[PDB]
Amino acid sequence: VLKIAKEPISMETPIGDDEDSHLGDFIEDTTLELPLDSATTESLRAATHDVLAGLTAR
Amino acid sequence: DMIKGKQGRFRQNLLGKRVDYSGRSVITVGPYLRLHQCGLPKKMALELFKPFIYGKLELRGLATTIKAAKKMVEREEAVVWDILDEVIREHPVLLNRAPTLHRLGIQAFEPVLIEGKAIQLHPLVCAAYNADFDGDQMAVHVPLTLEAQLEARALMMSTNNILSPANGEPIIVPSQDVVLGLYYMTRDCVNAKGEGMVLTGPKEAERLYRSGLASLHARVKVRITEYEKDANGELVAKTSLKDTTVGRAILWMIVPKGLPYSIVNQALGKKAISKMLNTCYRILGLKPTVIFADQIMYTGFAYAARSGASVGIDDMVIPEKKHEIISEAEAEVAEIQEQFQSGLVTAGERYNKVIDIWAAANDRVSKAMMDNLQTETVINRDGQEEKQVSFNSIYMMADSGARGSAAQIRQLAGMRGLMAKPDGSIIETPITANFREGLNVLQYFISTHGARKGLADTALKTANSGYLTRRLVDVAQDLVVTEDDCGTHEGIMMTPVIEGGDVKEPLRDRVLGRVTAEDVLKPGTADILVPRNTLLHEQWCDLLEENSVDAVKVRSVVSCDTDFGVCAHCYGRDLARGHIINKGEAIGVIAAQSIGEPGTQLTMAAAESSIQVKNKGS
Amino acid sequence: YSYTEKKRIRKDFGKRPQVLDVPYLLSIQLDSFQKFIEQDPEGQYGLEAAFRSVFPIQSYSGNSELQYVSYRLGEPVFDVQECQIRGVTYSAPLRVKLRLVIYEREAPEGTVKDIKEQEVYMGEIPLMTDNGTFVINGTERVIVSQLHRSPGVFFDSDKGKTHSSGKVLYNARIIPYRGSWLDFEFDPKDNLFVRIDRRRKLPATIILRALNYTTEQILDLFFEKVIFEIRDNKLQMELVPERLRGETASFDIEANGKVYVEKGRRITARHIRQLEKDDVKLIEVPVEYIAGKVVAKDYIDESTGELICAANMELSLDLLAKLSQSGHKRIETLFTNDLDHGPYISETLRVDPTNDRLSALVEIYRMMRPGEPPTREAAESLFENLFFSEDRYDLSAVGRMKFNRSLLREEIEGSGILSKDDIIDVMKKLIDIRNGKGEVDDIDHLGNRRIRSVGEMAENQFRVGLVRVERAVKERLSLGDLDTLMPQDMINAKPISAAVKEFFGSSQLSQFMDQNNPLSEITHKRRISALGPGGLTRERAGFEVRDVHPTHYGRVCPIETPEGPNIGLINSLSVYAQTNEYGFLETPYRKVTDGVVTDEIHYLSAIEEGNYVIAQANSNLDEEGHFVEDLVTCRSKGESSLFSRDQVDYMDVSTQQVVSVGASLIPFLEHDDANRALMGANMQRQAVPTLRADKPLVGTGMERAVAVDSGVTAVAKRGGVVQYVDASRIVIKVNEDEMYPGEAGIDIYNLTKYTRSNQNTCINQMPCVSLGEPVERGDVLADGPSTDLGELALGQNMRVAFMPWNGYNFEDSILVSERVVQEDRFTTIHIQELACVSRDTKLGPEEITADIPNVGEAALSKLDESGIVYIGAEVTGGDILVGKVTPKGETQLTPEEKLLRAIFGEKASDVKDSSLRVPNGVSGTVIDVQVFTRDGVEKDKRALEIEEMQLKQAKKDLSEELQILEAGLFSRIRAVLVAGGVEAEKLDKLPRDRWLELGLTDEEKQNQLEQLAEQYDELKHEFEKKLEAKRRKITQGDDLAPGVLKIVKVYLAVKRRIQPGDKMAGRHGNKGVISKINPIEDMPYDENGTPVDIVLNPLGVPSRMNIGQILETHLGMAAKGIGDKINAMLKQQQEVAKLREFIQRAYDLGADVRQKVDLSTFSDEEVMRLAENLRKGMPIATPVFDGAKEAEIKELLKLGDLPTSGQIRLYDGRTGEQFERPVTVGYMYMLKLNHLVDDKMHARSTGSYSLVTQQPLGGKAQFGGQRFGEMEVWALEAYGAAYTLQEMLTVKSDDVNGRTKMYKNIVDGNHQMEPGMPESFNVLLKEIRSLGINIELEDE
RNA sequence: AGGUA
């Protein structure tokens, strides 16, 4: 409840007491898949397709 | 508020359009590097090129997946390092200064792997970056796609940008240490080992110097083969004896074939070396110019190190008349103050007279100091003493123009003279001491005002220059060369400029690189020496100088009939080449940068009574 | 004479002996907070002032008043050390005595009942440390003193903007200490206007109308009456012969019955003197002269009361006839001279639309608040509270004293609220200045700018807190019971404490202490800021304030300020300057009697300085204060000039008083350019502490003072004999004459070792003393960071040669020998902090464990069974320190992932790895582990181990103290027991704890034995209670923010060595970056063979004007030559006599040196101690402007058997061939700045993107890319750079799809791009559409 | 916030 009682803060507030940079300028996007993982997924898809091609038809 | 921003739109351009595949680090000198390359630390190279490393590792099959390649590169095994060398070998990288004032603020270089953590920058290029190695940080960008790699190699490359975009004279000019080395190597003494010798080739000169059988500078007759570009562009080998010095012959060894020997047979300051590079580029081309610039850098550094040029405490010799001049000027200002109490002279006139007296005293002190330092050497040639250029080191850096001008040395060895107080008024009593005779408390407190004013002026002028160059870029944004030629006989009447009473900018410099708008006749006979509208290179300027025509009509961009752009001719030639501008070049942006970048350098009787012509003419 | 000085005597130059020892450099902060917190028996600065100002609080109906008695500071629950360890503030509870009094209900006042609340807790105030700092969140913060315009009246000149009229104007601003500003300004129409704050100007007479003044009253108070007697024809007037100045004869000037000056003539001083000597009483004047005059007051008929004249109209024939026929005889007109009091107030009254108090109040109420129908009561309340409410308007003592000073009153005190007389005086002064009689006052004179130190700012903020809690109390006194209720239940500590914490923690003037040097700390605590709340915003320049004013001399260091866009705003306070009683800057001056310069001092303020003439510190005095020049250089009115030696009134106390500590520490500052000296002083604060911090050879004498006065050095509070030496503890047996009555025992100094500073630099203290050394008060027991032998030792002294070397030192670059890294010098220790928080998420509480799913066993190796790395384990980038794991939520699987899990038989893990890895790029040893688990949450093994460690440490300390004390107790027990019958045979062989079992016959000895047995029991109880009290602190957990179950802090110590890329500099301002570390052989070497450690570009000297570095280099040769000679003597070990003679000659060598000579030291031990301390060179002290001359340096060089010119020919390392002409070599003090290249790299190809935009940036482990701003876009556009520009814009910046496709293509080995669209532009389109604006993309 | 160019 004590955690809930506090209100969210703006990103427009400066981080570090009036540095010309804002808080939101540092927030990392966690909903974006890393290109490393995307390349891994592409390679895995290619490998699985090749392996399935290595098996029989049915 | 999210749309409206400064400077410009935030997310789009500034602030700030962050970019991937980039690094940043402190820069150091790269005195072994070639001009077309720069030192890049191994760690930054590895981190920057991780996708390339993965690609090549999977290509040669040392890793079966991207994840395995990632494990290999984070383990930093010796295997990935050869891959890294391979990917770096041809890939050029862009080096960027923290502030970018003109297009030379970003230049391509071939990265060279170095153990360490700082980017090694070519010493010749730091002048363009306006970067001094005092903690300046530069950024590195990686042009990814093949088109971008090629684009960087063709345009971004340092060797392709040896000339400033604001003026044809080279921007990669030897600056301070190399200039000092060249000057010491070419400056002649009055007596030294091995004078009067006869030598064939500069190779014997280098042999004699390195063996210690002669001195670096000594009057010697040497047989040298100078090559002259003549006839149709063919080398003319002329072998004869020149009276020169050993250091000059050693330098001539470096100079590529095709230049007159007279260019090096002289004391070489900053101006001399810059002119020599300009002549080399105009006569030979690009590749000889780059090779010669690199070789002259190496030679200058080597012979500066061998020079042992050092600034001591004795190489600011105080002029002997400093006390006498100071005491005299004190006497006259005391007399003027006494007369002011008598009411004979007004306060303003008294102040002006005191200021003039102190200015005269300062000039006398500076002249005496310069006479003392300039010809300090009095050594005899064979027994007869003679007055010639001093071996004094501070006089070498003053004369060669490496660092420190006459005004600079004036505050060191003479007296630093008048300055100003708040309200910007010149102080009645100047500083009678210099930095070799330590300033007392009060005079230092006085100098503090000048220091504060200078620093605040630099800050405010930098901000104002940034705003100005932004506005220039805005107005000149959309302008681009869209046509090779439009066809127009309009233009501007072009003359050497004379403001006041004397010419300060001749016709040739203002017309060099311009296109003719009218076939101007000779000042005498009505003969056309300049054909229909054509680019004016150095040969045409020389022809115009020989037959001195008062005015030339020149196709200006303003009179160009092209719409949605300008024709190539109406612009000129200036870029990084002596050839006409290429269609598609954005002249607006280069012009805006050219006018904006020097903005940080901007910190600002017989007249109307009787006209006195200084020379004899009609 | 200090034994610390005995251990190393720095050779001090300087021909003028100082008469005033360097003040305690932190006196400003300490005195400020002492004034803030100490009790005051009267109304004085601090909490007492705020309380007495706000209390008593009167209830809005109820007769229930709250009265203040006193305040008491509770002892802090945690000391400084545990406050830093636990991350909690170091603060003292504030408890206040209050009484609620209820009077007669309801009748006239008079107490009926009263109740007292004792020591009510209304918040905790941060308590000041002994180093002059505050600990707030485990970080040591500093409150920078603020320079702000003093309360009072400023009569400023308005220039540069003239309302298209010229004639620059004047304006008087009344600036209150608290309240609303007042402005009286002029217009180019010679009218006066009043502005409350900065609202619309009103005609100036309105304020007087609101002050209940009639027009005639105003005219009487401002203008001078002129008497006109109605006699003869058309009146005569009573002429004062002194009144006529600068007037033309428009009226016959008669005297003694005849006219002297006829009409039309020019009146000069001759006619004026004739009139004065003739004493003209009255003159007949023509009516034409009358017609331009103005009547002062009203005039009605004397027989019928008909109004015929009123106040302030021009005179005319008809009005004169009416007043003559009415019966008047005396007419009082206004004296209006264009050089004397001009037509300002008259025309202002003409402009005035109001004529009464009510309309003035209406106008004021409407200008202050637009519209707002002017209720009479509301307007009256507004006017009264604007300037006459003590709780809404206050000038304070400083404001009142300045107010009376500018109006030239002998009073220096009075009511804070303004009075009508004060306002009228301000108007009169402003009008006189407009007439040219008065003079304007600068807003840059240090007399007009006051310094608010920490105490005053804290008191003001506490006053604001008291104001808001006063609002709460006044609401409660009517909302709550109007009868007896306990007052602790109606006082709210939350607002006051919260606001105080906001001030101390998050403010423009509360900064992390720049803690990488003792000098840095001293400068930060001495810093003076023109910014902050109530000061100047950075929207300035505004050259005036940034510029150095002539009053700064000796008060503010002129040559120390940042070069950023705050230059001349962040100053540093001078060495000798101190804050005046009223908050202004005062500097000491030696009082000068006409003939003799006395040694007594007076601290002169800024305004007082201008009155007298002050002699320069460079004046040469022989004997008892006698000048050697008849005309000596001095400064009287801000202008330097020669004055005869019989008019001087004061002299500068020392030659170093015109600079700050940072500037004063630079040697040969007199030989350096002010710009480059400024740069050097700024950089000197950025020096990183060095592992081998030896000393500067060429010092200035402030090294010892800076080291001692800063808190980093452990200084012996009470002298005695060193009883115990340890790297962590120093125990001193205090001298007999310095111990308190009874058993005071020992003094223990725990040495702070390897603790993280605010710059992530190690700060440790090493013991510089040994067993049995006699020490006295003020001695340096332990040398802190960048400090050795009590001297400030930021950088290191190194052999440097000024020469170009193959261009490696090209711009300002430094070339460094491999010997430097081999000697492990300039090798710094960086202690960085890492925090792993185990939180409580809604997916499940996080936990710390050794077993991490799907990780290598190497990671598990370095952790204990508790999941925490062992203390002392070596870790590198990427290694796991804390085994945090987070309860994994629902998992989505791609078809390929499902196929693979079906194949391998594996399934998704229920918990995801969240372990804290070391950020890549850093290494080092885990030196300390802190575990914080909040109370009520189960402890883990590692926390128990750490608590046991600290518990046993405290137990060991207590046991040592107790055993020493009880050993003394048992010794005196034996002494008592042996007396009164010999009992020393058996007792001596018995254990000391069995010495209380021996009885004795009834006597004073027996009573003493019983008392000492009781003392032993009391000591046992004291030990037990101390152990219990500290065990309560140790055992209890830390109450963290809600959500975090545990916190694990790990300290990484990186022994970061010097390498190419690191920024290195000198004290004089010479800068640079180390280019390449060459092998030791490549260094140029002298004839003896010593290779030079550092090579500097000499071309940086003659253009930076900093010749002082050359003199420092030469003096370094001199010092190191003396050191080499003494080292050769020590290796030869000649004798005590030879070494003593050589050292005495070295100290003697100079001219009029104040060094003082030996023998005053010990014969043998001290001589060898000095020799061993000087074998590395004799440190030399060069005062800032009383420094050594070239002749003295050359003499000292001759003593060192070194070339007089200071240049030695060096043989190259590569070729072994000597350079032509000698080269300058010498030992220069060089500094490694906190700009290490290791911190300066960041490089990325993939990583942190952003939410709203896709610009890559973020992360303290791997940062974003480099901002390709509009400048670089222009640079690319300048070339034909198109594809590279597109890469800069879309592929690598913001096009997420294009970015992924590029990464895949590069991995696959293909080089081409999708142009796509940057996500930033799509954001722009959507955001424009968010307005009422359509924007679209249209095809052709 | 401080510092760097």
Residue of C587, C655, C1210, C1268 to mutate when probing chain B, most B C-beta within 10 A = C1268
Q: How far is CA C656 from CA C17, C554, C1323, in A?
A: 12, 9, 60
Nucleotide nearest to B135 (CA to C1'): D5
Q: How far is CA C1163 from CA C1137, C1145, C1158, C1160, in A?
A: 9, 16, 10, 9
Closest CA to B125 of B100, B161, B166, B101: B161
**Contacts (Cβ under 8 Å, ≥6 apart) of C935:** C1036, C1037, C1039
**Residues in chain A, total:** 58
Nucleotide nearest to C682 (CA to C1'): D3
Cα–Cα distance for residue pair C923/C1120, rounded to 1 Å? 37
CB C252 within 8 A of CB C283: yes
CB C765 within 8 A of CB C784: yes
Cα–Cα distance for residue pair B530/C1172, rounded to 1 Å? 85
β-bridge partners, C651: C590, C615
Question: Is C1181 strand, coil or helix?
Answer: strand
Residue nearest to nucleotide D1 (CA to C1'): A17
Question: How many Å does it take to go from CA C459 to C1' D2?
Answer: 25
Reported as type and span, the H/E element at residue C456 is helix C454-479
Which residue do the tokens 């997916």 mark?
C843
**Contacts (Cβ under 8 Å, ≥6 apart) of C928:** C754, C871, C1049, C1050, C1051
Cα–Cα distance for residue pair C880/C83, rounded to 1 Å? 28
Chain A residues with CB under 8 Å of a chain C CB are 2-3, 17-18, 24-29, 32, 34-36, 38-39, 41-42, 44-45, 48
CB C711 within 8 A of CB C692: no
Reported as type and span, the H/E element at residue C1224 is strand C1223-1232
Q: First CA to last CA across chain C, in angstroms?
A: 93
Cα–Cα distance for residue pair C656/C658, rounded to 1 Å? 6
At residue C1259, φ and ψ (nearest 5 deg) are: 95, 130
Nucleotide nearest to C524 (CA to C1'): D2
Provide the phi-psi class of B238: left if phi over 0, else alpha when psi is between -120 and 50, else beta.
beta
Burial of C283: CB neighbours in 10 Å, binned 0-12, 13-18, 19+:
middle
Q: How far is CA C17 from CA B247, B440, C3, C410, C1004, in A?
A: 55, 16, 22, 39, 60
Nucleotide nearest to A18 (CA to C1'): D1
Residue B519, annotated as binding a ligand? no
Question: Is B570 strand, coil or helix?
Answer: helix
* DSSP per position, C386-449: HHS-TTT-B-HHHHHHHHHHHTT-S-----SS--HHHHHHHHHHHHHHHHTSS----SSSTTTE
Residue nearest to nucleotide D5 (CA to C1'): B136
Question: How many Å does it take to go from CA C1230 to C1' D4?
Answer: 19
Q: Are A17 and C507 in contact (CB < 8 Å)? A: yes
CA angle B543, B549, B550 (to 5 degrees): 145
Question: How many Å does it take to go from CA B279 to C1' D2?
Answer: 51
Q: In what order do the strands lie in the sheet with B198-200?
A: B198-200, B219-230, B234-245
What's B431's domain CATH number? 1.10.132.30
Cα–Cα distance for residue pair C340/C246, rounded to 1 Å? 9
Cα–Cα distance for residue pair C129/C710, rounded to 1 Å? 12
Interface of B with C in 420-439 (CB under 8 A): 421-422, 429, 435-436, 438-439
Q: Are B65 and A40 in contact (CB < 8 Å)? A: yes
Nucleotide nearest to C1234 (CA to C1'): D3
Question: Is C9 strand, coil or helix?
Answer: coil
At residue C896, φ and ψ (nearest 5 deg) are: -65, -40
Q: Are C1250 and A28 in contact (CB < 8 Å)? A: yes
Q: Taking the CA atoms of B34, B35, B40 and B45 in sequence, report the sign of the dihedral they define.
A: negative
Q: Are B151 and C1281 in contact (CB < 8 Å)? A: yes
**Contacts (Cβ under 8 Å, ≥6 apart) of B487:** B561
Pair of tokens at residue B59 = 């290509």
Rg for chain A, CA atoms, rounded = 23
Which chains contact C through at least 3 pairs of Cβ atoms less than 8 Å apart?
Answer: A, B
- In C645-745, the DSSP E strands lie at 650-652, 698-699, 714-715, 720-725, 729-734
Residue of chain A minimizing CA distance to C898: A48
Cα–Cα distance for residue pair C1204/C1208, rounded to 1 Å? 10
Closest CA to B561 of B497, B487, B618: B487
Q: Are B65 and A36 in contact (CB < 8 Å)? A: no
Chain D bases under 7 Å from protein CB? 1-5
Cα–Cα distance for residue pair A20/C371, rounded to 1 Å? 38
Burial of C1080: CB neighbours in 10 Å, binned 0-12, 13-18, 19+:
middle
β-bridge partners, C1018: none
Helix, strand, coil shares of chain A, percent, nearest 5, are: 50, 5, 50
CB C1267 within 8 A of CB C1293: no
Buried b (16+ CB within 10 A) or exposed e, C367-384: bbeeeeebeeeebbebbe
Cα–Cα distance for residue pair C147/C175, rounded to 1 Å? 15
Question: Is C71 strand, coil or helix?
Answer: strand
CA distance B211 to chain C (A): 10
Range of the domain at B414: 321-453
Which chains contact B through at least 3 pairs of Cβ atoms less than 8 Å apart?
Answer: A, C
At residue B217, φ and ψ (nearest 5 deg) are: -135, 120
Question: How many Å does it take to go from CA C131 to C1' D3?
Answer: 23
**Residues in chain B, total:** 618
CA distance B468 to chain A (A): 23
Question: Is C875 strand, coil or helix?
Answer: strand
CB C1335 within 8 A of CB B170: no
Cα–Cα distance for residue pair C633/B445, rounded to 1 Å? 14
Question: Is A7 strand, coil or helix?
Answer: coil
Residue B177, annotated as binding a ligand? no
CB C1229 within 8 A of CB C698: yes
Q: CA torsion, points C836, C840, C841, C842, in degrees to nearest 10?
A: 170
Q: Are C1264 and B18 in contact (CB < 8 Å)? A: yes
- In C270-322, the DSSP E strands lie at 282-284, 299-300, 307-309
Peptide bond into C1134 cis (omega under 30): no
Cα–Cα distance for residue pair C1186/C17, rounded to 1 Å? 10
Q: Spell out which residues of chain B touch residue C635, defining contact as CB-CB under 8 Å.
A: 442
At residue C349, φ and ψ (nearest 5 deg) are: -65, -40
Q: Are B50 and C1246 in contact (CB < 8 Å)? A: yes
Residue of chain B minimizing CA distance to C1325: B3
At residue C105, φ and ψ (nearest 5 deg) are: -115, 105
CB C605 within 8 A of CB C451: no
Residue of C1110, C1266, C1323, C1330 to mutate when probing chain B, most B C-beta within 10 A = C1266
Q: Taking the CA atoms of C349, C353, C356 and C357 in sequence, report the sign of the dihedral they define.
A: negative
Which residue do the tokens 């306070």 mark?
C573
Closest CA to B316 of B401, B386, B411: B411
Q: First CA to last CA across chain A, in angstroms?
A: 58
Cα–Cα distance for residue pair C1151/C1154, rounded to 1 Å? 9
Residue of chain C minimizing CA distance to B396: C1099
Residue B302 touches partner C, C-beta closer than 8 Å: yes
Q: Provide the total of helices (H) and of strands (E) in chain B, helices listed first.
A: 20, 15
Closest CA to C328 of C299, C285, C296: C299
Residue B189, annotated as binding a ligand? no
* DSSP per position, C552-606: GTTTEETT---SSTTTTTEEEE-SS-EE-TTS-EEEEEEEE-SSSEEEEEEEE-H
CB B96 within 8 A of CB B144: no
At residue B415, φ and ψ (nearest 5 deg) are: -140, 140
Rg for chain C, CA atoms, rounded = 40
Cα–Cα distance for residue pair C500/C514, rounded to 1 Å? 22
Cα–Cα distance for residue pair C1017/C1011, rounded to 1 Å? 10
β-bridge partners, C1053: C831, C925
- In C127-181, the DSSP E strands lie at 134-135, 140-143, 145-149, 152-158, 169-175
**Contacts (Cβ under 8 Å, ≥6 apart) of B479:** B565, B566, B586, B587, B588
Which residue do the tokens 């074998």 mark?
C1175
CB C532 within 8 A of CB C508: yes
Provide the phi-psi class of C88: left if phi over 0, else alpha when psi is between -120 and 50, else beta.
beta
Q: Which of A3, A25, A42 sits opposite C1304 (nearest CB)?
A: A42
Which residue do the tokens 């609080």 mark?
C57
User: How does strand C1207-1208 pair with strand C1223-1232?
Assistant: antiparallel
Q: First CA to last CA across chain B, in angstroms?
A: 67
Helix extents (H) in B476-613: 507-511, 538-546, 568-571, 587-596
Count CB neighbours of B356 within 10 A: 12
CB B80 within 8 A of CB B42: no
Peptide bond into C542 cis (omega under 30): yes
Cα–Cα distance for residue pair C166/C811, rounded to 1 Å? 51
At residue C141, φ and ψ (nearest 5 deg) are: -105, 155
Question: Is C147 strand, coil or helix?
Answer: strand
Pair of tokens at residue B323 = 């006390």
Which DSSP letter does residue C1099 get? Answer: G
Residues with CB under 7 A from strand D: A 14, 16-19; B 98-99, 131-132, 134-136; C 508, 511-512, 514, 529, 531, 562-564, 566, 570, 679, 682-683, 686, 1071, 1235
Pair of tokens at residue B505 = 């900018």
Residue B132, annotated as binding a ligand? yes
* DSSP per position, B298-319: HHHHHHHHHHT----SSSSPPP
Pair of tokens at residue C854 = 């799907």
Pair of tokens at residue B471 = 């506005």
Amino acid at B273: I
DSSP collapsed to 3 states, B318-345: CCCCHHHHHHHHHHHHHHHHHHHHCCCC
**Contacts (Cβ under 8 Å, ≥6 apart) of C1304:** A35, A38, A39, A42
* DSSP per position, C960-1001: HHHHHHHHHHHHHHHHHHHSSS---HHHHTS-GGGTTS----
Q: Are A45 and C896 in contact (CB < 8 Å)? A: yes
Question: Is B584 strand, coil or helix?
Answer: coil
Which residue do the tokens 């402030």 mark?
C702
Rg for chain B, CA atoms, rounded = 29
Which DSSP letter does residue C487 get? Answer: G
Count CB neighbours of B56 within 10 A: 21
Pair of tokens at residue C783 = 């040398």
User: How does strand C585-592 pair with strand C578-579?
Assistant: antiparallel
Q: Provide the total of helices (H) and of strands (E) in chain C, helices listed first.
A: 38, 65
CA distance A35 to chain B (A): 10
CB C640 within 8 A of CB C651: no
At residue C596, φ and ψ (nearest 5 deg) are: -110, 135
Helix, strand, coil shares of chain C, percent, nearest 5, are: 30, 25, 45
Residue B455 touches partner C, C-beta closer than 8 Å: yes
Which DSSP letter does residue C639 get? Answer: -
Q: Are A29 and C1300 in contact (CB < 8 Å)? A: no
Residue of chain A minimizing CA distance to B2: A12
Count CB neighbours of C1339 within 10 A: 3
Q: Are C1272 and B152 in contact (CB < 8 Å)? A: no
* DSSP per position, B232-252: TTEEEEEEEEEEEEHHHHHHH
Cα–Cα distance for residue pair C498/C124, rounded to 1 Å? 9
Buried b (16+ CB within 10 A) or exposed e, C777-788: eebbbbbbbbbb
Nucleotide nearest to B462 (CA to C1'): D5
CB C701 within 8 A of CB C1183: yes
Pair of tokens at residue C307 = 């109004």
CB B79 within 8 A of CB B62: yes
At residue B349, φ and ψ (nearest 5 deg) are: -65, -40
CA distance B509 to chain C (A): 23
Nucleotide nearest to C686 (CA to C1'): D3
CB C157 within 8 A of CB C434: no
Cα–Cα distance for residue pair C521/C544, rounded to 1 Å? 29
At residue C732, φ and ψ (nearest 5 deg) are: -115, 130
**Contacts (Cβ under 8 Å, ≥6 apart) of C1019:** C962, C965, C966, C969
β-bridge partners, C183: C173, C195
Count CB neighbours of C30 within 10 A: 18
Q: What is the largest CA-CA distance in chain B?
A: 101
**Contacts (Cβ under 8 Å, ≥6 apart) of B257:** B227, B235
Q: What is the resolution of this structure in A?
A: 3.5
Question: How many Å does it take to go from CA C564 to C1' D5?
Answer: 10
Question: How many Å does it take to go from CA C656 to C1' D2?
Answer: 27
Cα–Cα distance for residue pair C252/B577, rounded to 1 Å? 90
Question: How many Å does it take to go from CA C710 to C1' D5?
Answer: 30
CA angle C114, C116, C117 (to 5 degrees): 145
Cα–Cα distance for residue pair C1073/C1062, rounded to 1 Å? 6
Q: In what order do the strands lie in the sheet with C236-238?
A: C282-284, C236-238, C225-229, C330-334
